[PDB]
């Protein structure tokens, strides 16, 4: 649970003097790009349901075991719970790019998730493929422009790829 503003605050406090000028240029341009950041988050969560079903539909086309009997996501509540997990991972990566920091993502959802999926018997690499495909669709939804002024969101395309990558690598 850390905003990038209080990242600068906590780092300057552990240093113990005032915030330097170079960090203030950086924070000013953060303020000038946070416009892009916040509603980049909301256009990612615009089609969040269709993103979730498309990524899961692709995943169960790629791995036919998970809808085959004996698979991990075979019965109806296990399949619904898998959709719930993919929605949760998308929602937390959405929170993380809203805070501007991956601290909420690594702090709120990813950390014990590795041990949870190992102890349940859940495959982790399938989740990794799902979050990677979900991230591709996620930037492109935000990236593509429909009824929006043209702008440089390259950093947003950049940082959200970083956040989805941290999610997929921390699932493992």
């Amino acid at each position: 649970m850390f905003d990038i503003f209080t990242r600068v605050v906590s780092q300057a406090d552990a240093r113990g003097e005032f915030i330097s000028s170079d960090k203030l240029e950086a924070l000013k341009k953060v303020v000038a790009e946070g416009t892009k950041r916040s509603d980049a988050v909301s256009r990612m969560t615009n089609n969040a349901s269709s993103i979730v079903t498309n990524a899961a539909r692709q995943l169960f086309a790629d791995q036919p075991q998970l809808i085959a009997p004996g698979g991990n996501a075979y019965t109806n509540r296990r399949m619904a719970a898998c959709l719930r997990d993919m929605e949760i991972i998308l929602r937390y990566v959405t929170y993380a790019t809203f805070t501007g920091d991956a601290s909420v993502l690594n702090d709120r959802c990813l950390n014990g998730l590795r041990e949870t999926y190992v102890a349940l018997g859940v495959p982790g690499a399938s989740v990794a493929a799902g979050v990677r495909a979900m991230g591709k669709a996620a930037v492109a939804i935000v990236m593509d422009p429909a009824g929006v002024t043209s702008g440089d969101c390259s950093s947003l395309q950049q940082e959200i790829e970083l956040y989805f990558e941290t999610a997929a690598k921390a699932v493992e």
Partner: protein, 225 residues
């Protein structure tokens, strides 16, 4: 009858005082007395469901307790009791886990704290098999720690999970303890291997064209006139 074992408590973020202040890591507190509009009942009922069942689907929801609580005859403490003795909790949590892991999970979800030691779960595992799940949940609710920390009219939460000026405080206990363990997924037999590596197709190995090969100029000849 036979009383409990006396187990010594161990150190934790709960039995200590702590100088709490209003922040977000503090869980939003949901209380029956001040929700008085119809939507805030929905938020409270959703929060109690998030604690006891971890996002209960519509099958898991009990119509009678929600109905009766919106009227207001039910106390949220009695609502949590009704959730714990409801069959979707018994089916998901008492069936699949052993007595010791069940007491671990139930202490975490009712009291909002990790049990102090393994011998505490051992000492509390007498009462559930001898006197039933109803008596276990009843004796859990009657203890003074649940009452001082939450009371009659407060949905429980994980208490003092996160300390100040920490990135992480602690795992939220909804992530940490799921309803299966390793022992019962072994009975369900889930790790059937995905087996999508090294399939070894038998078709003849591709060889890179040697210098001066006719093919090398194939791709440009296709583009040329």
């Amino acid at each position: 009858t036979i009383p409990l074992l006396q187990y010594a408590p161990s150190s934790q973020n709960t039995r200590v005082a702590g100088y709490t202040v209003g922040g977000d890591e503090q869980p939003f507190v949901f209380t029956t007395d001040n929700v008085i509009s119809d939507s805030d009942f929905d938020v409270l009922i959703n929060a109690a469901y998030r604690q006891i069942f971890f996002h209960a689907f519509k099958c898991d929801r009990q119509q009678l307790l929600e109905s009766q609580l919106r009227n207001g005859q039910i106390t949220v403490r009695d609502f949590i009791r009704g959730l714990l003795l409801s069959e979707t909790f018994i089916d998901s949590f008492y069936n699949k886990n052993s007595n010791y892991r069940f007491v671990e999970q139930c202490i975490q979800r009712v009291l909002g704290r990790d049990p102090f030691s393994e011998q505490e779960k051992i000492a509390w595992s007498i009462v559930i098999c001898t006197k039933g799940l109803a008596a276990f949940v009843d004796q859990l609710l009657n203890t003074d720690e649940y009452m001082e920390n939450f009371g009659y009219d407060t949905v429980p939460y994980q208490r003092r999970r996160s300390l100040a000026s920490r990135e992480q405080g602690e795992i939220p206990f909804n992530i940490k303890s799921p309803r299966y363990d390793a022992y019962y997924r072994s009975q369900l037999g889930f790790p059937q291997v995905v087996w999508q590596n090294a399939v070894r197709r038998f078709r003849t190995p591709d060889r890179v064209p040697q210098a001066g090969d006719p093919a090398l100029f194939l791709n440009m000849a296709r583009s040329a006139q």
